Structures are given as C-alpha cells and as structure tokens.
Ligand SMILES: Cn1nnnc1SCC1=C(C(=O)O)N2C(=O)[C@@H](NC(=O)[C@@H](O)c3ccccc3)[C@H]2SC1
Ligand SMILES: Cn1nnnc1SCC1=C(C(=O)O)N2C(=O)[C@@H](NC(=O)[C@@H](O)c3ccccc3)[C@H]2SC1
C-alpha cells in the first residue's frame with residue numbers, strides 16, 4: 001500500500017512528505033498529504049516563467065535587464081557571472097528554471113510588476129489558472145524561510161500539480177510559448193537526484209526543483225512513459241523536526257518517485 005510506504009519514508013527521513021499525481025483515464029489520482037501546504041521554494045519559477053511568457057510578445061525575451069551589486073542576495077549561479085553586462089529576459093528565464101537562480105527569479109517578478117515586487121501579479125496568474133490555494137508573498141531568499149506551518153509562500157502538491165498540468169499538457173500557453181517553458185524544464189540541471197532518479201531511463205522527465213530552510217526539498221515534473229503517455233508528479237517535503245538548518249533530503253523524493261513509478265509502470 002502506497003500510503004504505508006510514504007509513511008515509512010517520513011519516519012526514515014524525519015520528514016513530512018506530500019505527493020500528488022492527477023488521475024488519468026486509466027489511473028486513479030495518487031495522493032498523500034496532497035492538500036497540505038508546503039513552501040514553493042524555487043518550484044514557483046516554472047509558473048513565473050509561464051506568466052512572463054504569457055504577458056508579453058515573444059521578442060520580449062530579447063529585452064536586456066541590468067542589475068547591480070545590491071540585487072545579488074540569494075544563490076544565483078548565473079546572474080552573479082553576468083552582473084557587469086546584464087541579462088536578457090530569455091537568459092533570466094533560462095537561469096531561473098535551469099539553475100534556480102534567485103536573482104533571475106526576482107528580476108522576473110519585477111518584470112511582471114505590480115504590488116509586492118511582482119508577487120501579487122504572480123499569485124493572480126495562478127488564480128487565473130483556477131488555483132485558489134497557492135500564494136507568493138516574498139522574493140528570494142525570504143520565500144524559503146517561513147516557519148513550518150506558516151501559509152506565506154506556500155502551495156500544495158495538488159494545487160501545483162494542476163497548475164503544471166495546465167502549463168505543460170493543457171492550453172494555458174500557446175504552443176510556441178509552451179515549448180519554451182517545456183524545453184527549459186527538460187534541460188534542467190538541478191533535478192537528477194529527485195523525480196528523475198525514481199523513473200526508469202526510458203521514461204522522459206522534465207522538472208523544476210525547490211530547496212529551502214527547515215529541510216525543504218520539492219520537485220514538480222511531467223513524465224512521459226516509453227509509449228508517450230504523460231503523468232504529472234508533484235512531490236514536496238520538509239523536516240521541521242531538524243529546525244531551520246535541517247538539510248534537504250533529495251533521497252526522500254527519489255524514493256517517493258520510485259514508489260509512484262512502480263504504480264504507473
Ligand atoms: C543535495 N542537495 N540537493 N539540493 N540541494 C542539496 S544540498 C543543499 C544546499 C547546500 C548544502 O550545503 O547542503 N549548499 C551549499 O553548500 C551551497 N552552495 C552554493 O550555495 C553554491 O555553491 C551553489 C549553488 C547551486 C549550484 C552550485 C553551487 C548550497 S546549494 C544547496
Ligand atoms: C513533450 N515532448 N517533447 N519532446 N518529446 C516529447 S514526448 C512526445 C509528445 C507527447 C506524447 O504523448 O509523447 N505529447 C503530449 O503529451 C502532447 N502535448 C504536449 O506534451 C504538449 O502539451 C506540449 C506541446 C507543445 C510544446 C510543449 C508541450 C504531445 S507533444 C509530443
């Protein structure tokens with residue numbers, strides 16, 4: 001039984017684990033703590049890039065954004081290297097997805113604009129996709145830091161799975177913009193040890209990870225079977241029992257994904 005397996009993983013990793021896989025015509029939804037809130041961490045970058053793509057003509061990707069020393073205040077593997085030249089919106093989208101670049105995410109929030117440095121407009125974008133649960137309240141790095149149980153900067157496995165389903169498999173974006181989002185997630189550099197690790201090599205996986213304080217580790221993915229049948233997989237976790245400095249445990253996500261893959265294979 002899946003729920004027993006997931007509960008065993010929670011005990012193993014001193015963690016809280018949330019899992020959602022939407023139903024298909026032949027598979028029931030998989031749910032474990034699916035409606036409990038967990039911090040987004042960088043998983044929000046996927047719908048953030050969708051929002052920026054949706055909002056603008058595609059040639060907005062070529063607009064140069066300049067930024068300075070006081071803009072680098074979070075892990076930013078790409079933006080730190082390009083601070084002297086600026087980055088285009090397309091480069092920012094690439095970095096935000098593929099490297100979880102926090103400065104890139106903050107600059108994209110600013111590009112979206114409006115109250116809360118773009119966080120209200122981001123939340124509004126999710127509302128437009130029928131998500132009345134998720135909320136973004138802070139930028140990077142603060143959005144990773146809310147205490148366990150705090151609702152700020154949270155989604156749920158169920159909510160984020162349904163959002164990602166619309167973005168990747170549905171019609172939230174026109175095909176040209178959808179392809180940009182999907183390809184950036186396909187070329188992600190941060191997810192090899194999470195959902196990807198739980199699915200056989202002949203399944204395709206595209207994903208966006210998140211990692212935060214209090215042992216937070218997330219991954220949201222779309223996977224395709226070897227015959228092209230897609231599934232959406234959201235796995236979220238935290239480790240409040242270890243306090244603020246608890247390490248994220250990628251292996252919890254890999255094991256959870258292995259259990260999911262066993263059901264879907
Ligand atoms: C196993 N796993 N999976 N996901 N997260 C983890 S471990 C959590 C984690 C730790 C930690 O110490 O344990 N960190 C560092 O150490 C910091 N390194 C950097 O800030 C920086 O060098 C960097 C950031 C990103 C890419 C390359 C370089 C960060 S990176 C996040
Ligand atoms: C997804 N991909 N990329 N490279 N190889 C693949 S798997 C082959 C494939 C499958 C399938 O059932 O094998 N598809 C879907 O599922 C249908 N749509 C989407 O995936 C779609 O919502 C989307 C359309 C346009 C741009 C981005 C996303 C098609 S797309 C072709």
Ligand SMILES: Cn1nnnc1SCC1=C(C(=O)O)N2C(=O)[C@@H](NC(=O)[C@@H](O)c3ccccc3)[C@H]2SC1
Pocket residue numbers: 242245246247248249
């Ligand atoms: C309960 N127990 N007993 N023995 N092993 C365990 S649990 C295994 C384990 C976990 C874990 O994931 O569970 N860790 C963290 O999280 C990491 N802590 C830090 O990075 C940080 O707080 C720190 C870095 C340097 C000096 C002091 C603190 C390491 S500690 C090893």
Ligand SMILES: Cn1nnnc1SCC1=C(C(=O)O)N2C(=O)[C@@H](NC(=O)[C@H](O)c3ccccc3)[C@H]2SC1
Pocket residue numbers: 041042043074075099100102140141144189190208209210211212213
């Ligand atoms: C790829 N890699 N390689 N080694 N470790 C990695 S992890 C990939 C990664 C992700 C992610 O998308 O999973 N991130 C976030 O989410 C952002 N979290 C924060 O900035 C954050 O404040 C924070 C960072 C670390 C510890 C506690 C809080 C960053 S951090 C880098």
Ligand SMILES: Cn1nnnc1SCC1=C(C(=O)O)N2C(=O)[C@@H](NC(=O)[C@H](O)c3ccccc3)[C@H]2SC1
Pocket residue numbers: none
């Ligand atoms: C670019 N790169 N190189 N290697 N991995 C990478 S990817 C980024 C990354 C870095 C880094 O260097 O940025 N890491 C550390 O530093 C390690 N942190 C720890 O193991 C950890 O917190 C710890 C636990 C217990 C005691 C002491 C330290 C890992 S975590 C992954």
